[PDB]
Amino acid sequence: GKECDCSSPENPCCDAATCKLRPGAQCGEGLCCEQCKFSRAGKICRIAKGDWNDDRCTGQSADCPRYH
C-alpha cells in the first residue's frame, strides 16, 4: 500500500517508526503470518463452507485468497 506493513503499533513485526515490517521477520499481519515469519505453504487460512478442498497458503505469502 503506502509505507506500512502492519496496522498495530504493539505488533512485534513492524518498525513502529516507519509503520513497516521489522527487517528480520517476513510478515507483520496476515491469515498465514507466523510469528514474524512467512508461514509455509499448505497452511489452512480458512475452511470451505460444506465439504471439499480448503484454503491453503503458499510458502512465500502471508495472506489468504478465497475459493469457497
Q: Are 37 and 27 in contact (CB under 8 A)?
A: yes
Between CA 33 and CA 31, with CA 3 as vertex, the angle to 5 degrees is 15
Experimental method for this entry?
A: NMR
Q: Are 41 and 16 in contact (CB under 8 A)?
A: no
Q: What is the enclosing helix (H) or strand (E) of 43? A: strand 43-46
Cell numbers given for 52? 471439499
Length of the chain: 68
Q: How many CA atoms lie less than 13 Å away from 20 in the CB half-sphere?
A: 6
CA distance 55 to 50: 13
DSSP secondary structure code for residue 10 in this structure: S
CA distance 35 to 40: 12
* In the chain, where the domains are located: 1-68
Cell numbers given for 50? 460444506
Give how far the C-alpha of residue 54 lies from the chain's centroid of Cα atoms, to the nearest Å: 17
Specify the fold of 1-68: Echistatin (4.10.70)
Cell numbers given for 19? 509503520
